[PDB]
Amino acid sequence: KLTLHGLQQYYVKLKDNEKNRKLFDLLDVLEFNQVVIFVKSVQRCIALAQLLVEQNFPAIAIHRGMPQEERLSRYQQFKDFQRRILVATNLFGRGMDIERVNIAFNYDMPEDSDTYLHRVARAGRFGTKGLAITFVSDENDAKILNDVQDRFEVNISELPDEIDISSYIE
Amino acid sequence: ADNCIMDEHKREIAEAKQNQKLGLLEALLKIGDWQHAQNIMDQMPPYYAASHKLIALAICKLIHITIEPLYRRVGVPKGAKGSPVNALQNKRAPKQAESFEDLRRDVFNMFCYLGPHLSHDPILFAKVVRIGKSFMKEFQSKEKTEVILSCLLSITDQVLLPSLSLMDCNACMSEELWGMFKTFPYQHRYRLYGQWKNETYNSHPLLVKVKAQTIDRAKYIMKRLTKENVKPSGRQIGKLSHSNPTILFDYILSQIQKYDNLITPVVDSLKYLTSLNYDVLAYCIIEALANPKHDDTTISSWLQSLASFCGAVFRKYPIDLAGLLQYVANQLKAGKSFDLLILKEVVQKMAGIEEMTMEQLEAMTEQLKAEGRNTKKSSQRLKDALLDHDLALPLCLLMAQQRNGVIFQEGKHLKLVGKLYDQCHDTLVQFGGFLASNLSTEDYIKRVPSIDVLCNEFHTPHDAAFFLSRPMYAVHEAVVSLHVSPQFYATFWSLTMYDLAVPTSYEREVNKLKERCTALQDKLLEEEKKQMEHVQRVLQRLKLEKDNWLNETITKFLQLCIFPRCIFSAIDAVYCARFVELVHQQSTL
Amino acid sequence: APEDFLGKKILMGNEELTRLWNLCEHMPTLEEFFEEAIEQANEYKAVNNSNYGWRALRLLARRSPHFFQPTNQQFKSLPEYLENMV
Amino acid sequence: GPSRYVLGMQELFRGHSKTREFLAHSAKVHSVAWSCDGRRLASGSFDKTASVFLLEKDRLVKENNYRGHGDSVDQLCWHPSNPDLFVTASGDKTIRIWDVRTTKCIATVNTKGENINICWSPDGQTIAVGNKDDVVTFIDAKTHRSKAEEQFKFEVNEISWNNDNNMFFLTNGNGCINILSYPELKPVQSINAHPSNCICIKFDPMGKYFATGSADALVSLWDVDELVCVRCFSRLDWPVRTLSFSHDGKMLASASEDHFIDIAEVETGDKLWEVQCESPTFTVAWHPKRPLLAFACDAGTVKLFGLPN
């Protein structure tokens, strides 16, 4: 069963249009091995992937509008450290079995607590520390964050200006 | 008014932490006047004078005008024209240098004032580097020479290395400096590297800006590159290294030891570094191993990652590993046996030495042992580094006793000490094998003292003593030396397994059955017949020895012959069994 | 003034490396090791710790000719065998 | 501020920034070089021909297309003091000397095979042609007889002369540049310059500097008198394929495998106009008189950059 002990979860309150720029700021400060960014649709996913490839960031997109074999091929290319950022609308469950993953951006809000858990929680073998950052845009974000805190008994504090380096990286 | 100058210098320092005087100076250096120029430059902040472009250009013009004769005579590059400087006509001139002494006094006095502002004139950088290289390769190939060498090492650390840190991306000025740097011993080179890493970037606000920019660009391309695109990204790191190798390599080493992946992309992107940058990368590896936990009941992951990076980067690129072995030997002298790990990796990665089943075990008991080159150039560098600095015997004799020091001096949990002793013993065995392989009877017999000297003087146990002495032999005096039946003691500890029981024809015919293959099979059969004759001849001399060989009669034999031998290594275990059974059988019960 | 840069002390600019370069048996022999067992002869004694009992068995291998001796009396516990061999 | 010269040239390029293309051949254009004065411009193509354009006012017309070769033409060079004489080194193991005044083959010389790069001695007396198996042949330009041959055992990419015609510069793929004494060809020096291959070398018309390009996106500007690397330009990202010096030596234009050509001031090295269209370039030349430059990017066509708008 997926657990949440060993993951740091924050939130940032902003608009909907500023979620791109703000994201870049994070990728300009936070040190990471591989970053998985979750969106809600395929159009926004392809737009974000193209916007990241327009930058020097190597980004690969795995959305729900793909064949299963293509999804597996792209996920295997991403597992071999061939590309850093993975813009995924969803996964195949089982948490996140990729040990190299450090940061997880909830660019959009998931459906319910099971979705937030499958997005945040991991199922690795050696890597127990990691960071998860969810963007807050309206009151629904705060309500679902409170629901997550009530269901999983976790803490979702506000993101400060400085983060400890060894707190989420072993 | 000389005070607004101090205020503006304070401003320059502070903003980075977050004129008739100079008009005279430029016109006072323009004719001949050096003494009054010194008097003017001393009455202001340290580098406020040469911080401007005009004053630095005037000082450099004066310097090369005074230095012209020495350079024209002993420093012009082969196959150039050169620009005669037409020395100045004043009688108050600084008396142009002629041979390495007037240079010393006047030119070093006038170089002290420049600092990291030689970058305005790269022509003087080259002239001074060439003069230094000529002086080194001439004189060092002596009190005055020692003083000149010290002054040259000071001029380097003060002017040359900081000025090389402000040139944007000079891959040629980093390969011109290493024309002179390849003549210093590695201790002076490491001094200069440590000083211009830890001290020059603190002062000199321009150097602080350069450090900030280099760390920024290093953070940029590191989190960004791929496993896919290596060397569209090796070029960026190459340029950053041409600029500031110390900072760049320190940051990327931190990243390597932190993430423990992305180590192969990095040891692959380090393809466009200059030789000076390889020398600086070696020092950064050493420093990252030395300065910084570290136990956590099991050897830490960061040390394993550093060791893997070191093995890879020393196997791939020519990096002149001399400080690494001396550092490992010093750590052993200090009583710490963890860095032996990385040493193992080196000997394991750039020599192809690398549990085993009975098939390969019998094969390891002379072509089958080499079977089980791509490591004919790296092993050459390893052997050269071992022979030049005389580090084979010291390292072996250090491990031989440090294996006891690990367990008894506690240098816990009873599971960490076991693995550490195991690692030390295995590294000793592997290094002794490498030496016996590649330092042949010539270097071996000459640089390995006899057992009469080892156990008596260099406090070494009998096991490692005989392990190192065996290749020299390939008796009564040796026995009396070892005890201080003695003949039995020497006979047992001298004979290996290879000269007691012959294999190999099966696997030989399997692998052979192809002109090269046929030639290899013929050579292997020749070796097999030679070993047959070897075993026959060895068993021949055994009879008369058995005649005069010899309760607790076997108990002394049992412990001090069987136990260390059988415990030492698996081949030694099979030998210890075969010996007793075959020879001692033909008291056994 | 750059009158002299070096000295005979190898500096090795890094201050930690300065210590290593300018820096420069292991068997207590049966009496410097124990030093207590004879003086203590079992709740919190010294022959109740394996981290010492293991090293005593590693030391009794090189010396103490009564180690490989055929005792064969089936001593129930290592502390019993170890105290008799001191 | 940047400089006075940079601002002046930026004004000139603000007024004159129209690039126009002209149809040369029916295949990939390998090399394009200008005349001795600057009226004619020739270009050699993969369709084993060499076209010759006449620069009239602002657009250059097609004067002729010289036919005949056994393989693709890899390099062109014009006589350094004769406006109507040039040489085309091709595959097919030959080198032909064309005349523009009468449109006829003046001479043909058979070499040891697979020529790549040539240059004409700044006197106009000897032609040096290197081939794909690192052999450099020295031919007498007036007698059309091979007078010297040299094997080097490294890989020599591009060759040049001291421009006083008393030294010979080769660039070896190991990352060095070799200097030989010309009139009696004996190796004089080797300069370890770049961490990787040296692909091109050019001498500016004035005689102060010479520039080399490396296979790691570096251009280095060596000083001819003292052989000192003064400054390195690093704004490309791919191996530098071609260099050129302006008609006076202040501007240097470099083109490589990434999407734009860049002009840089020689004295400062900071930056100047950069032309960004598409289709990585591999051959670039300036004009001997005017400040307008031709190039061949990416069925083949020659583009200009300068006068009109």
Curated annotation (Swiss-Prot), chain A:
Going by the UniProt record, its keywords in alphabetical order are:
Acetylation, ATP-binding, Cytoplasm, Helicase, Hydrolase, Isopeptide bond, mRNA processing, mRNA splicing, mRNA transport, Nucleotide-binding, Nucleus, Phosphoprotein, RNA-binding, Spliceosome, Transport, Ubl conjugation
- Keyword Glycoprotein applies: no
Query: Keyword Ubl conjugation on this protein?
Result: yes
Q: Which domain of life is it from?
A: Eukaryota
GO MF terms listed in the record are: ATP binding; ATP hydrolysis activity; ATP-dependent activity, acting on RNA; ATP-dependent protein binding; identical protein binding; mRNA binding; RNA binding; RNA helicase activity
Indicate where this protein resides in the cell: Nucleus; Nucleus speckle; Cytoplasm
Record annotation: effect of changing residue 28 to R: Abolishes interaction with SARNP
Any one biological process term the GO annotation gives: RNA export from nucleus
Q: GO CC: one term?
A: U4 snRNP
Domain Helicase C-terminal: start-end pairs: 6-167
Q: Which family does the UniProt entry place this protein in?
A: Belongs to the DEAD box helicase family. DECD subfamily.
Q: Please quote what the entry notes about the protein's domains.
A: The helicase C-terminal domain mediates interaction with ALYREF/THOC4.
What exactly does this protein do?
A: Involved in nuclear export of spliced and unspliced mRNA. Component of the TREX complex which is thought to couple mRNA transcription, processing and nuclear export, and specifically associates with spliced mRNA and not with unspliced pre-mRNA. The TREX complex is recruited to spliced mRNAs by a transcription-independent mechanism, binds to mRNA upstream of the exon-junction complex (EJC) and is recruited in a splicing- and cap-dependent manner to a region near the 5' end of the mRNA where it functions in mRNA export to the cytoplasm via the TAP/NXF1 pathway.
Q: What is this protein called?
A: Spliceosome RNA helicase DDX39B
Q: Which gene encodes it?
A: DDX39B
From Swiss-Prot, chain B:
What family does this chain come from, according to its entry? Answer: Belongs to the THOC2 family.
Query: Could you describe the subunit structure of this protein?
Result: Component of the THO subcomplex, which is composed of THOC1, THOC2, THOC3, THOC5, THOC6 and THOC7. The THO subcomplex interacts with DDX39B to form the THO-DDX39B complex which multimerizes into a 28-subunit tetrameric assembly. Component of the transcription/export (TREX) complex at least composed of ALYREF/THOC4, DDX39B, SARNP/CIP29, CHTOP and the THO subcomplex; in the complex interacts with THOC1, THOC3, THOC5, THOC7 and DDX39B. TREX seems to have a dynamic structure involving ATP-dependent remodeling. Interacts with POLDIP3 and ZC3H11A.
Shown part of the complete sequence: 291 to 1014 of 1593
Q: Which domain of life is it from?
A: Eukaryota
> What is its biological role?
Component of the THO subcomplex of the TREX complex which is thought to couple mRNA transcription, processing and nuclear export, and which specifically associates with spliced mRNA and not with unspliced pre-mRNA. Required for efficient export of polyadenylated RNA and spliced mRNA. The THOC1-THOC2-THOC3 core complex alone is sufficient to bind export factor NXF1-NXT1 and promote ATPase activity of DDX39B; in the complex THOC2 is the only component that directly interacts with DDX39B.
> Where is it located?
Nucleus; Nucleus speckle; Cytoplasm
The scientific name of the source species is: Homo sapiens (Human)
Specify the protein name: THO complex subunit 2
- State the coiled-coil residue ranges: 504-550
Give tissue specificity per the record.
Expressed in the hippocampus and the cerebral cortex.
Task: Give the span(s) annotated as MIF4G domain.
Answer: 204-350
Swiss-Prot record, chain C:
PTM statement from Swiss-Prot or TrEMBL: Expression is altered specifically during apoptosis and is accompanied by the appearance of novel forms with smaller apparent molecular mass. Polyubiquitinated, leading to proteasomal degradation; probably involves NEDD4.
Q: Which domain of life is it from?
A: Eukaryota
Q: Which cysteines are joined by disulfide bonds?
A: none
- Inducing stimuli: Up-regulated during cell proliferation.
Tissue specificity statement from the Swiss-Prot or TrEMBL entry: Ubiquitous. Expressed in various cancer cell lines. Expressed at very low levels in normal breast epithelial cells and highly expressed in breast tumors. Expression is strongly associated with an aggressive phenotype of breast tumors and expression correlates with tumor size and the metastatic state of the tumor progression.
Subunit annotation:
Component of the THO subcomplex, which is composed of THOC1, THOC2, THOC3, THOC5, THOC6 and THOC7. The THO subcomplex interacts with DDX39B to form the THO-DDX39B complex which multimerizes into a 28-subunit tetrameric assembly. Component of the transcription/export (TREX) complex at least composed of ALYREF/THOC4, DDX39B, SARNP/CIP29, CHTOP and the THO subcomplex; in the complex interacts with THOC2, THOC5 and THOC7. TREX seems to have a dynamic structure involving ATP-dependent remodeling. Binds to the hypophosphorylated form of RB1. Interacts with RNA polymerase II. Interacts with LUZP4.
- Family affiliation: Belongs to the THOC1 family.
What protein does this entry describe?
THO complex subunit 1
Curated annotation (Swiss-Prot), chain D:
**Subcellular location, in the record's words?**
Nucleus; Nucleus speckle
What GO biological process terms are annotated to this protein in UniProt?
mRNA export from nucleus; mRNA processing; RNA splicing
Question: What highest taxon heads this organism's lineage?
Answer: Eukaryota
Q: Does the keyword Ribosomal protein apply?
A: no
Q: MF terms per GO, please? A: RNA binding
Q: Where are the WD repeats?
A: 24-65, 68-108, 110-149, 151-192, 193-232, 235-274
One short Pfam family name for this protein?
Beta-prop_THOC3
InterPro entries the UniProt entry points to = G-protein_beta_WD-40_rep (IPR020472), Tex1/THOC3 (IPR040132), WD40/YVTN_repeat-like_dom_sf (IPR015943), WD40_repeat_dom_sf (IPR036322), WD40_rpt (IPR001680)
Keyword set, alphabetical order: Acetylation, mRNA processing, mRNA splicing, mRNA transport, Nucleus, Repeat, RNA-binding, Transport, WD repeat
A cellular-component GO term for this protein: nuclear speck
Its annotated function is as follows:
Component of the THO subcomplex of the TREX complex which is thought to couple mRNA transcription, processing and nuclear export, and which specifically associates with spliced mRNA and not with unspliced pre-mRNA. Required for efficient export of polyadenylated RNA and spliced mRNA. The THOC1-THOC2-THOC3 core complex alone is sufficient to bind export factor NXF1-NXT1 and promote ATPase activity of DDX39B.
Q: Which family does it belong to?
A: Belongs to the THOC3 family.
Q: What is this protein called?
A: THO complex subunit 3
Q: Which gene encodes it?
A: THOC3
